UniProtKB/Swiss-Prot annotation:
Record lineage: Bacteria, Pseudomonadati, Pseudomonadota, Gammaproteobacteria, Enterobacterales
Protein name: Molybdenum cofactor guanylyltransferase
One Gene Ontology term of the molecular function aspect: GTP binding
Annotated organism of origin: Escherichia coli (strain K12)
GO biological process: bis(molybdopterin guanine dinucleotide)molybdenum biosynthetic process
NCBIfam families in the cross-refs: molyb_mobA
Essential cofactor(s): Mg(2+); Mn(2+)
């Protein structure tokens, strides 16, 4: 009953009892994933999080936590598919839990620039961010087929699905990633 569901992708796996839980690192007191969820809630009424470790902690801010299917598909596409299989509604705006500075016109600009494509993603002027992506329902069967086929490559999938990049080069450092504790330390 809203047009796009926002989704924070907080990672899959724990293919060696985790390591650092990136989404739970705190940037100025607030977990990175909650920075992203808050930014998505500025622009979208319905936001959920895909998390596969420390689920009770993710649950504490009162959003729906969605875990990956038993299929244990690889890579960020596995989380995308698991969320489309467990949420209704025609459009999803995915964003990793690592990009706390995403802007309040993310959804609006991706939608304005979608131009009939079933998926679009952010390009920051330097690189693609294919997991910051507005994705239509129609992608779900294609994603299932790709991951059942043993594939993992994100950009290859986005190309196969007929997507395109949307230029956010004018949004300075809104798309920076905080992948390690060492980077985070800098941004405080
Ligand atoms: Li642990």
């Amino acid at each position: 009953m809203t047009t796009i569901t926002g989704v924070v992708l907080a990672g899959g796996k724990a293919r060696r009892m985790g390591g650092v839980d990136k989404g739970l690192l705190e940037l100025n007191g607030k977990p990175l994933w909650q920075h992203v969820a808050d930014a998505l809630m500025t622009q979208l009424s319905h936001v959920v999080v895909n998390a596969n470790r420390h689920q009770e902690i993710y649950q504490a801010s009162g959003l729906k936590v969605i875990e990956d299917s038993l299929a244990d598909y690889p890579g960020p596409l596995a989380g995308m598919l698991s969320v489309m299989q467990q949420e209704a509604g025609e459009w999803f705006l995915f964003c990793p839990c690592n990009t706390p500075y995403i802007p309040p016109d993310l959804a609006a600009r991706l939608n304005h620039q979608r131009k009939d494509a079933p998926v679009v993603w952010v390009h920051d002027g330097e690189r693609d961010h294919p997991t910051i992506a507005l994705v239509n329902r129609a992608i779900e069967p294609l994603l299932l087929e790709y991951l059942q086929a043993g594939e993992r490559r994100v950009m290859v999938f986005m190309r196969l699905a007929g997507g395109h990049a949307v230029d956010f080069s004018d949004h300075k450092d809104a798309f920076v990633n905080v992948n390690t504790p060492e980077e985070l330390a800098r941004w405080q």
